[model samples]
Target chain A: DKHSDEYKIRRERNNIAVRKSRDKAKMRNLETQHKVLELTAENERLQKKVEQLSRELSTLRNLFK
Target chain B: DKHSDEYKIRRERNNIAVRKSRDKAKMRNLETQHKVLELTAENERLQKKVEQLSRELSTLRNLFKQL
Candidate 1:
């Protein structure tokens, strides 16, 4: 009957939305992972820069004294 | 006899390592998300400050002109 056929179409459309939502979440998780990598690298760079700057500051202070 | 025993223990240990690695990655992902939010808030605060200062500068210029 047309009723069951329409019901099937509606169910399929809903399934597609659910699938799309799940896929979107998966993409978000992957994107977050990549962002973590980027932040980790930047954090490491900043830590090294701080150490280097601290040493330079110490040398400058010594020269001043 | 003891070989199977060692195999089972080794396999369990490997599984634990795998689990720990995955959990660590998830934790790092969350930490990064928190950092993003923190930085975003800080950025917004500074932007508001910049706007306020710009407005104050204009007001000061106007007041100076009146002087």
Candidate 2:
């Protein structure tokens, strides 16, 4: 009985579910963007630390000469 | 009008769209996981480099005390 009131109600419920699912998807996209930004910044910081330490090591090594 | 063949076809189409959307969501999840793993490994390598350099610097500084 696709023409019944129940069928109409079921479609309405599914519409709401679809809207909720779309919103969740959008939230996940935002979270991924945020995580990528965070990791990128962390990587940059680590690289800079490496550079600073390397310079210190070089300056110390030159003292031997 | 809802009992027509057109409405049935519409429902079938929507169902397929929902399945496709779910698959896309799963792919995004896998991509994020891969990115995180890659970044984590790179960070570890950089940290190790920093540690090695620090040790070299400390060893040279100690030479001053002995000589």
Candidate 3:
């Protein structure tokens, strides 16, 4: 029934649905990337704080002796 | 020609493709969750190191003042 009007309508509906689904998937991917970048930046900041504290501890230890 | 064999074959192929796409999407979600968990754990570990170092530094500073 490819030539029928009903079949044509069904195909049009499906095409729209497919396009919407793909757009949603693309947005999810972008959100994941944003989350990863934010977490990576925070992790680096914490690492630097640890290093700074360690240096302070070492300097204090030297003064104690 | 809904009763035709060709129509049935097309429907079956489309169904299979849809299922495969859904499964791949599910895997991507799981992978993202795993990555977040790993990063969170590492962040907490670094935070603890910072606290420990700060405490040691405070103790050493007090000792220096006493001398």
Per residue, candidate 2 scores C-alpha lDDT tens digits across B2-64 of 899999999999999999999997887778867878887888898788788778878877887
lDDT agreement with native, every candidate: 0.69, 0.85, 0.85
| TM-score, A chain, model 1 | 0.78
Which interface RMSD values do the candidates have, in the order shown?
9.4, 1.9, 1.8
Model 3 chain A worst lDDT run, 10 consecutive residues: A56-65
* Stretches > 4 Å off in candidate 2: A1-36, A62-65, B64-67
Angstrom error of the Cα, residue A55, model 3: value is 1.9
The residue-by-residue lDDT of candidate 2 on A2-47, one tens digit each, is 7989999999999999999999978877787677778889899989
Per-model TM values vs. the true structure = 0.47, 0.62, 0.56
C-alpha RMSD in Å of predicted model 3 compared with the true structure: 5.8
- Candidate 3 — which residues are off by over 4 angstroms? A1-33, B1-18
Judged by DockQ cut-offs, is candidate 3 incorrect, acceptable, medium or high? acceptable
For candidate 2 chain B, the 10 contiguous residues with the lowest summed lDDT are B56-65
Error of 1 at B19 (Å): 15
Name the TM-score of candidate 1: 0.47
Task: For candidate 3, write residues A1-65 as lDDT tens digits.
Answer: 99999999999999999999999987887787677777889999988988888888776667636
